[PDB]
Design a protein around this ligand. Structure first.
Ligand code: HEM
Ligand code: HEM
Ligand code: HEM
Ligand code: HEM
Ligand SMILES: O=N[O-]
Ligand SMILES: O=N[O-]
Ligand SMILES: O=N[O-]
Ligand SMILES: O=N[O-]
Lengths: 140, 134, 140, 134
C-alpha cells in the first residue's frame, strides 16, 4: 500500500530520470543479466552483449511499463493485467527474479541520481517496485 | 566464492576508495529505513524514529564500520569465508544488507559502479551473506 | 488473486477441519517454534513447551483470524486491517516468518486431512495463506 | 547439518518406512502444481497441463525417485553434504521442494509426523537445499 509520500517520492524520481528512462531500463537489464546469470535463460533469442539493440529496445519497454504503473498507481492491477498474464501464465517467470530486477533498477537510479536517491526516496522506490512485482506475479 | 581475476580487480580497485567511516553506516542505516523489521534486530541503538534519525545515530555509524570491516575480511579470504567469519536471523536479511550496500556503493561511485563491477560485488556480498548465515 | 475454485477449495478444507481449527492452529505454532527456532523470539513471555495453555490460546486466535479471512475472502485488506498494523507496525515481524508459519499450517492440515489435502487443494491453500500474508505485511 | 542423535533417530525411523517408489514423484509433482514456474525447469517431461496430468507423468515419478535418492545420500552423509552432491536455478526453489516433500511426508504419515519429527526433517532439507545450491 503506497502512501501519499511514496507516490510523491516515486513521481519525483521519475521526474529526475526524465527522458533517460529507456536508457536506464536498458542498463538495469544489463546489470541483471551480468549479476544474476540465471535470468538470461528467459532471453535465449536475445543478444545480451553490451550495446545490444535488443537490450536497448527491451529496457525502453520495461521503463514504459513502469511509467504506466506510476501513471495509474492506484489501479495497478488493471493497468498491468495483460503484463501479469504474459509474465506468469505465458513466460512462467520465477517470482524471485522480480526482486533481482527490482534491485537492479534501484542500483541504476542510485548510480545516476545521487541527489534524489535519499534513504526516504530509496524506501519509496523499493515499495513501488515490490508493488509492481506483486501485480506481475499474481496470475500463476 | 570463485572470483575471476578481473572480478577481483573490479572489487579491489573500487574498494580502496571507499570512505570506510561513512559507507557502512549508510548501508546499515538504509537497511533500517527500507526494511523496518530490521530495527527490532537492534534493541539498544535507541532512537530510530525517522530516516533522518536513523542515519544520524552513533551506534549505526559505529556498527557500519564493522560491516565494512567484515566485508574487507571476506574479500581477502574468499578462499575460506566460513573460517573467517567464525563468531545473527534469516539468511535473507544478510542478503538484503548486501544489496543495500551495493546500492550505497552505486550511490557513492556513480558511473564508476559499472554493470560488470556490480556483478563482481554481488558475488562477494552473496558469499559473505551465506557465510554469515551458517 | 483467488479463483472461484481456490475459494471453493479453501472453504471445503475449512469445512473438514471443523471445530478442530483452534487445536490445529496450536499444533502449527508448535511445528513453527520447533522447526524454525528464530520465530520464538517474537514470543519471549510465552511458555512454548508442549501443551502450553498460551500456545493453545494463541493458536485459537490464529485459526479465528484465518477463518475471518476466508469468511470475507474478497475483502481481506479491510477485514485484516487491525491485524496487519499490529504485525508490521507494532510487532515488526520479519516478512519471511509468514512463509514459515504458512508452511507449518499446510503441514498441519496435511497431517490431519489426508483425503482433503490433494495437489489442487494444497495449491489453493498455499495461495490463500500467501494472500493473507501479503495483507499482514503491507503496513511497514 | 548438525543433527542431534534424537533428531537423527526421528529422521531415520520414519525414512525407513517411506515408499521410495511414490513419495518422490508426489513431492516433485506437487511442486510443479503448487509452483507453476517450476514446470519451465522441466522442458522434456511433456504434458503438465493439469494437476492430474502432472501427478501421472512417468518422468515426474522417475525423477522423484532420484530426489528421494539424493535425500538418502545426504542423510547418511550430513557430515559433508557438499562433497556428496558434487554434480541446477535459485536456491529458493530447492527450499520449496524441500518443504513440499515435508508436506508429502506429513500427508503420508499423519500423526506420526509429529512436530519434533518435522523439526528434524527441516534441518535435513535445509542442508540438502543449501548443498544443492552451491
Ligand atoms: C518490474 C518487473 C518487470 C517489468 C515492468 C517487465 C516488463 C515487461 C514488458 C513491458 C514486456 C513486453 C510487453 C509486451 O511485449 O507486451 C516484457 C516481456 C518479457 N519479460 Fe518482463 N518485466 C518485468 C520483469 C521480468 C523478469 C524478472 C523477467 C525474467 C527474469 C522478465 C522476462 C521477460 C521476457 C523473457 C519477456 C519477453 C521478451 C521478448 O520476447 O521480447 N520480465 N516484460
Ligand atoms: C552483518 C551484521 C553484523 C556484523 C557484520 C557485525 C560485526 C561485528 C564485529 C566485527 C564486531 C567486533 C568488533 C570489535 O571487536 O570491536 C562486533 C561486535 C559486537 N556487535 Fe556486531 N555485527 C553485526 C550485527 C550485530 C547485531 C544485529 C547486533 C545486535 C546488538 C550486534 C551487536 C554487537 C555487540 C554487542 C558487539 C560487542 C562489542 C565487541 O566486542 O566488538 N552486531 N560486531
Ligand atoms: C498467517 C499469519 C498470521 C496470522 C493469521 C496471525 C494472527 C494473529 C492474531 C489473531 C493475533 C492476536 C490479535 C489480537 O490480539 O488482536 C496475533 C498476534 C501476534 N502475532 Fe501473529 N499471525 C500471523 C503471523 C505471525 C508470525 C509469522 C509471527 C512471528 C513469527 C507472529 C507473531 C505474533 C506475536 C508475537 C503476537 C502477539 C502475541 C501476544 O502477545 O499474545 N504472527 N497474530
Ligand atoms: C533437486 C533436483 C534434482 C535432483 C535431486 C536430481 C537428481 C538426479 C540424479 C541422482 C541423477 C542420476 C541418476 C542416474 O544415474 O540414473 C539425475 C540424472 C539426470 N537428471 Fe536430474 N535431478 C534434479 C533435477 C533435474 C532437472 C531440473 C532436470 C532437467 C532436465 C534433470 C534432468 C536429468 C537428466 C537429463 C539426467 C541424466 C540421466 C542420468 O544419467 O542419470 N534433473 N538427476
Ligand atoms: O525485463 N523484463 O522484462
Ligand atoms: O555480533 N554478534 O554476533
Ligand atoms: O502466531 N501468529 O500470531
Ligand atoms: O541433473 N543435472 O544436474
Amino acid at each position: 500500500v503506497l502512501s501519499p509520500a511514496d507516490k510523491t517520492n516515486v513521481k519525483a524520481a521519475w521526474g529526475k530520470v526524465g527522458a533517460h528512462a529507456g536508457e536506464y531500463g536498458a542498463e538495469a537489464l544489463e546489470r541483471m543479466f551480468l549479476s544474476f546469470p540465471t535470468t538470461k535463460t528467459y532471453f535465449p533469442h536475445f543478444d545480451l552483449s553490451h550495446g545490444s539493440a535488443q537490450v536497448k529496445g527491451h529496457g525502453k519497454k520495461v521503463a514504459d511499463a513502469l511509467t504506466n504503473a506510476v501513471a495509474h498507481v492506484d489501479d495497478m492491477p488493471n493497468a498491468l493485467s495483460a503484463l501479469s498474464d504474459l509474465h506468469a501464465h505465458k513466460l512462467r517467470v520465477d517470482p524471485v527474479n522480480f526482486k533481482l530486477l527490482s534491485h537492479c533498477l534501484l542500483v541504476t537510479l542510485a548510480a545516476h541520481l545521487p541527489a534524489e536517491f535519499t534513504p526516504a526516496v530509496h524506501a519509496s522506490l523499493d515499495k513501488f517496485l515490490a508493488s509492481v512485482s506483486t501485480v506481475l506475479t499474481s496470475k500463476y | 566464492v570463485h572470483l575471476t581475476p578481473e572480478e577481483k580487480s573490479a572489487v579491489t580497485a573500487l574498494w580502496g576508495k571507499v570512505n570506510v567511516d561513512e559507507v557502512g553506516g549508510e548501508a546499515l542505516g538504509r537497511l533500517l529505513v527500507v526494511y523496518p523489521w530490521t530495527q527490532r534486530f537492534f534493541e539498544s541503538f535507541g532512537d530510530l524514529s525517522t530516516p533522518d534519525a536513523v542515519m544520524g545515530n552513533p551506534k549505526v555509524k559505529a556498527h557500519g564500520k564493522k560491516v565494512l570491516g567484515a566485508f574487507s575480511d571476506g574479500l581477502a579470504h574468499l578462499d575460506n569465508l566460513k573460517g573467517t567469519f567464525a563468531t545473527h536471523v534469516d539468511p535473507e536479511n544478510f542478503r538484503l544488507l548486501g544489496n543495500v550496500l551495493v546500492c550505497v556503493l552505486a550511490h557513492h561511485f556513480g558511473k564508476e559502479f559499472t554493470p560488470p563491477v556490480q556483478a563482481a560485488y554481488q558475488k562477494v556480498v552473496a558469499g559473505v551473506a551465506n557465510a554469515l548465515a551458517h
